[PDB]
Amino acid sequence: RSLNCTLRDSQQKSLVMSGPYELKALHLQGQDMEQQVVWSMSFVQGEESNKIPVALGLKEKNLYLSCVLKDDKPTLQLESVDPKNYPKKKMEKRFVFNKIEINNKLEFESAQFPNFYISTSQAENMPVFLGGQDITDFTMQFVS
């Protein structure tokens, strides 16, 4: 099961590629919006509640957000996967985020690293990371 969408932070910053395996966030409006990443948010197995477990993959690309230790700290990366095996329901835990609806916003908690969240900086054109000054609330926009 999946939804096609874009995500913006609570400062209306869009998400764009930073190199092949990272994302950055910045203020896009008009024609430059086409720069933004389009996601396939898949609804995967995992504990749920009225926290929904999801995976965040680039739509039609075999690249998924995932949470790993890098320099011994929880780190957000885009990770290549075998296109014959994805998407799937039972995604590996590094790829799972608990989607939380709070105050008409969304937060994405790492399933591998409890209470670490997809975050953006206030400053322009900085990496999206795993983590209050920083931003952890998003809105979703559906796309066809």
From Swiss-Prot:
PTM notes: Activation of the IL1B precursor involves a CASP1-catalyzed proteolytic cleavage. Processing and secretion are temporarily associated. (Microbial infection) Cleavage by S.pyogenes cysteine protease SpeB promotes its activation independently of CASP1.
Subcellular location: Cytoplasm, Cytosol; Secreted; Lysosome; Secreted, Extracellular exosome
Gene Ontology terms: biological process: apoptotic process; astrocyte activation; cell-cell signaling; cellular response to interleukin-17; cellular response to lipopolysaccharide; cellular response to mechanical stimulus; cellular response to xenobiotic stimulus; cytokine-mediated signaling pathway
Keywords tagged on the record: Cytokine, Cytoplasm, Inflammatory response, Lysosome, Mitogen, Pyrogen, Secreted
Keyword Cytoplasm: yes
Tissue: Expressed in activated monocytes/macrophages (at protein level).
A molecular function GO annotation: cytokine activity
GO cellular component: cytosol; extracellular region; extracellular space; lysosome; secretory granule
Annotated site (Important for interaction with integrin): 51, 59, 61, 70, 84
Effect of residue 22 to N: Requires 2 nucleotide substitutions
Motif Involved in interaction with TMED10 C-terminus, residue range(s) on this chain: 108-121
UniProt keyword Secreted present: yes
Residues the UniProt record annotates as site (Involved in receptor binding): 1
Regulation acting on activity, per entry: (Microbial infection) Cleavage by S.pyogenes cysteine protease SpeB promotes its activation independently of CASP1. SpeB-mediated maturation of IL1B plays a dual role depending on infection site: while IL1B inflammatory response prevents bacterial growth during invasive skin infections, it promotes streptococcal infection of the nasopharynx by disrupting colonization resistance mediated by the microbiota.
Consequence of substituting residue 101 to K: Enhanced integrin binding
Effect of residue 113 to C: No effect on binding to IL1R or on IL1B activity. Markedly reduced activity. Markedly reduced activity
Induction data: By LPS. Transcription and translation induced by M.tuberculosis and a number of different M.tuberculosis components in macrophages; EsxA is the most potent activator tested (at protein level). In pancreatic islets, release is increased by high glucose treatment. In pancreatic islets and macrophages, release is also increased by endocannabinoid anandamide/AEA.
Purpose: Potent pro-inflammatory cytokine. Initially discovered as the major endogenous pyrogen, induces prostaglandin synthesis, neutrophil influx and activation, T-cell activation and cytokine production, B-cell activation and antibody production, and fibroblast proliferation and collagen production. Promotes Th17 differentiation of T-cells. Synergizes with IL12/interleukin-12 to induce IFNG synthesis from T-helper 1 (Th1) cells. Plays a role in angiogenesis by inducing VEGF production synergistically with TNF and IL6.
Quaternary structure annotation from Swiss-Prot or TrEMBL: Monomer. In its precursor form, weakly interacts with full-length MEFV; the mature cytokine does not interact at all. Interacts with integrins ITGAV:ITGBV and ITGA5:ITGB1; integrin-binding is required for IL1B signaling. Interacts with cargo receptor TMED10; the interaction is direct and is required for the secretion of IL1B mature form. Interacts with HSP90AB1; the interaction facilitates cargo translocation into the ERGIC. Interacts with HSP90B1; the interaction facilitates cargo translocation into the ERGIC.
Family: Belongs to the IL-1 family.
Miscellaneous note of the record: The IL1B production occurs in 2 steps, each being controlled by different stimuli. First, inflammatory signals, such as LPS, stimulate the synthesis and promote the accumulation of cytosolic stores of pro-IL1B (priming). Then additional signals are required for inflammasome assembly, leading to CASP1 activation, pro-IL1B processing and eventually secretion of the active cytokine. IL1B processing and secretion are temporarily associated.
Record protein name field: Interleukin-1 beta
UniProt source species: Homo sapiens (Human)
Source taxonomy: Eukaryota, Metazoa, Chordata, Craniata, Vertebrata
Gene name, Swiss-Prot/TrEMBL: IL1B
